[PDB]
């Protein structure tokens, strides 16, 4: 896999994709 | 933390992964 | 606003929307 | 959880502000 | 709900999340 | 180009796509 | 509808484009 | 207008609400 | 059609719409 | 990370994001 | 081809990059 | 090439549908 650059809502996809059935949790800073 | 490193410089799918459930 | 069906990436895309700077968890499993 | 509430079945985006932190 | 930072499609995607069945025109400057 | 099934938040993407600065309206109601 | 025309039947971005302003 | 706003500042859901049909 | 200013994943979304069943091939520089 | 059904402009938006520079191509014909 | 092993199958991130140049 | 020419700058569907197989 290559490295990423993901802001906003790629980044909310990009963990949904690697987590799948999982789930993730999204936590920004402040 | 991951979220601003994702888009200020890069980050993998393996840093990612750290935050399934 | 409305209720629709909010499903795979969209769900966890609409949880960015509405939570934002919050974060949110997104947990298929329960 | 989520998916039923909002995939299977629909929520307003109020109720998707049940899952945020 | 949080403040939205939005640009380009991201736009789009949040007024049909917001719409929903009503639907939503999109209206830029020029 | 093509002609495929564009739903939901897939036919406003299209739709910001072919309009962009024109912009559009999404009337699912008809 | 645009939803008939082109979710639920299929449409060409030139249909699409009918939906523009 | 609400277009250059949302991408240029900020805006809020309920000032999208303004924008449905 | 209008001319498009696509970044990122915007642009696969948009190659994708516009190849519809023909697919397409994704060649970023380097 | 998982096995999940990936479609339409979801199997290519995950292409980018597992191919990124590499590209990638998307001929759902075979 | 990738449709059917990704989307009517199910498959992996590393099954993705199959697809990859 | 076009990845590039559309994210500096601009490109038009008719150059995006030279990249379809
Ligand atoms: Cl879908
Ligand atoms: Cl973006
Ligand atoms: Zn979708
Ligand atoms: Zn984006």
């Known amino acids: 896999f290559v ?3 993901l802001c906003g ?3 909310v996809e990009a ?3 690697v987590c799948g059935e999982r789930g993730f949790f999204y ?3 402040t | ?3 601003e490193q994702c888009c200020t410089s890069i980050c993998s799918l393996y840093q990612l992964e750290n935050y399934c459930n």
Chains 1, 3, 5, 6, 9, 10 share one sequence.
């Open chain 1, 27 to 29: 936590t920004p800073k």
């Open chain 1, 9 to 11: 809502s790629h980044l």
């Open chain 2, 1 to 3: 933390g991951i979220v």
């Open chain 1, 15 to 17: 963990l949904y994709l």
């Open chain 1, 3 to 5: 490295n990423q650059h």
